[PDB]
Design an enzyme around this catalytic site. Structure first.
Site, PDB file in Angstrom:
ATOM      1  N   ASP A 250       0.846  -1.194   0.000  1.00 40.22           N
ATOM      2  CA  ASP A 250       0.000   0.000   0.000  1.00 40.22           C
ATOM      3  C   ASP A 250       0.886   1.251   0.000  1.00 40.22           C
ATOM      4  O   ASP A 250       1.972   1.230  -0.599  1.00 40.22           O
ATOM      5  CB  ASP A 250      -0.954  -0.077   1.217  1.00 40.22           C
ATOM      6  CG  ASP A 250      -2.280   0.645   1.006  1.00 40.22           C
ATOM      7  OD1 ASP A 250      -3.334  -0.044   0.889  1.00 40.22           O
ATOM      8  OD2 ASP A 250      -2.244   1.905   0.992  1.00 40.22           O
TER       9      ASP A 250
ATOM     10  N   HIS B 278      -3.590   6.031   3.843  1.00 37.58           N
ATOM     11  CA  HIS B 278      -4.391   4.887   3.408  1.00 37.58           C
ATOM     12  C   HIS B 278      -3.788   3.568   3.893  1.00 37.58           C
ATOM     13  O   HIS B 278      -4.492   2.729   4.465  1.00 37.58           O
ATOM     14  CB  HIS B 278      -4.488   4.940   1.883  1.00 37.58           C
ATOM     15  CG  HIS B 278      -5.344   3.884   1.258  1.00 37.58           C
ATOM     16  ND1 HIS B 278      -4.825   2.676   0.843  1.00 37.58           N
ATOM     17  CD2 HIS B 278      -6.651   3.880   0.902  1.00 37.58           C
ATOM     18  CE1 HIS B 278      -5.783   1.962   0.286  1.00 37.58           C
ATOM     19  NE2 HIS B 278      -6.901   2.665   0.313  1.00 37.58           N
TER      20      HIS B 278
ATOM     21  N   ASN C 116     -14.056  -0.244  -6.390  1.00 32.97           N
ATOM     22  CA  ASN C 116     -15.104   0.676  -5.957  1.00 32.97           C
ATOM     23  C   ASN C 116     -15.865   1.277  -7.133  1.00 32.97           C
ATOM     24  O   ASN C 116     -16.227   2.455  -7.115  1.00 32.97           O
ATOM     25  CB  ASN C 116     -14.530   1.793  -5.090  1.00 32.97           C
ATOM     26  CG  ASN C 116     -13.708   1.270  -3.948  1.00 32.97           C
ATOM     27  OD1 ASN C 116     -14.037   0.252  -3.342  1.00 32.97           O
ATOM     28  ND2 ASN C 116     -12.601   1.940  -3.670  1.00 32.97           N
TER      29      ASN C 116
ATOM     30  N   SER D 136     -11.126  -1.102  -0.093  1.00 33.18           N
ATOM     31  CA  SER D 136      -9.844  -1.053   0.593  1.00 33.18           C
ATOM     32  C   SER D 136      -9.968  -1.325   2.080  1.00 33.18           C
ATOM     33  O   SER D 136      -8.993  -1.769   2.687  1.00 33.18           O
ATOM     34  CB  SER D 136      -9.204   0.321   0.439  1.00 33.18           C
ATOM     35  OG  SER D 136      -8.655   0.511  -0.848  1.00 33.18           O
TER      36      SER D 136
END
Ligand code: CA
Length: 279
Positions: free
Chosen positions: A39, A69, A161, A224
């Site tokens: 990530d 994130h 998404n 996520s």
């Protein structure tokens, strides 16, 4: 063990019903397992990680998470308050820059890095990788995810998404990994969650409280956020000896809550990750 006033998603993955607020789990808590968070990095110095997190690779000028994130995702895997597997070891691999994006060539290298690097780490209960990332379909990205899984790592990836079929996104569309959709606290499919035959499982993904950079916390939403619930669950179950890296996605699907979610289109599994912890 029982954690009162836990984030709703933790309470959800240990419950046969929505609408509760305590997280129940075996106190082993993923000890002896390892989870790689591939990530934007992990703010390891954060007390919530209690020294159990460490950066092991970056493809950028720094290993610092300048976004948040990756720190949020790592917190859902394994932070003391916001994590599923509160004693796992967390390893950060920074394939995403501080704006939250990365080139597929870098993401691929990071996956192959994890497949090798686990041989440098002590993970007697097994190894998991959490990939809250992706873009459009790429056979090369999918084959990297397939290699990582084949190498003995439980790979969990975000479905995406786009409120669309995950068949068009990578690494979501790689069949051999664990592709994770998102749900909300009322057991709806999250409005943005991808779907389709390639999904293996849903996890909590709307309004998820976890760690953030600057020693902070916040709630955010996405596939996520669902992915690290499943990655942490896998680590937890592997520490308990219930399953293995090769078999954990199937085991999670076998033991999931069935039929609880709404707005699952025909041909997509109706399955919500569940730890079946029965004190
Ligand atoms: Ca799969």
């Amino acid at each position: 063990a029982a954690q009162t006033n836990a984030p709703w998603g933790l309470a959800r993955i240990s419950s046969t019903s929505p609408g509760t607020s305590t997280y129940y789990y075996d106190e082993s808590a993923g000890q002896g397992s390892c989870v790689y968070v591939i990530d934007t990095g992990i703010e390891a110095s954060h007390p919530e990680f209690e020294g159990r997190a460490q950066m092991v690779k970056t493809y950028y000028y720094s290993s610092r998470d300048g976004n948040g994130h990756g720190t949020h995702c790592a917190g859902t895997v394994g932070s003391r308050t916001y994590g599923v597997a509160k004693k796992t070891q967390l390893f950060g691999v920074k394939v995403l820059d501080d704006n939250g994006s990365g080139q597929y060539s870098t993401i691929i290298a990071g996956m192959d890095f994890v497949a090798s690097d686990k041989n440098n780490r002590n993970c007697p209960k097994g190894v998991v990788a959490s990939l809250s990332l992706g873009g459009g379909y790429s056979s090369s990205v999918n084959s990297a995810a397939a290699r990582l899984q084949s190498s003995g790592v439980m790979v969990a990836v975000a479905a995406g998404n786009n409120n669309a079929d995950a068949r068009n996104y990578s690494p979501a569309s790689e069949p051999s990994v664990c592709t994770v959709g998102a749900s909300d606290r009322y057991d709806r499919r999250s409005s943005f969650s991808n779907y389709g035959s390639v999904l293996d499982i849903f996890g909590p993904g709307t309004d998820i409280l976890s760690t953030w950079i600057g020693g902070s916390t916040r709630s955010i939403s996405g596939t996520s956020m669902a992915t690290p619930h499943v990655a942490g669950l896998a680590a937890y179950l592997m520490t308990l000896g219930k399953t293995t890296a090769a078999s954990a996605c199937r085991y999670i699907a076998d033991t999931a809550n069935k039929g609880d979610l709404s707005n699952i289109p025909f041909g997509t599994v109706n399955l919500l990750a569940y730890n079946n912890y029965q004190a």
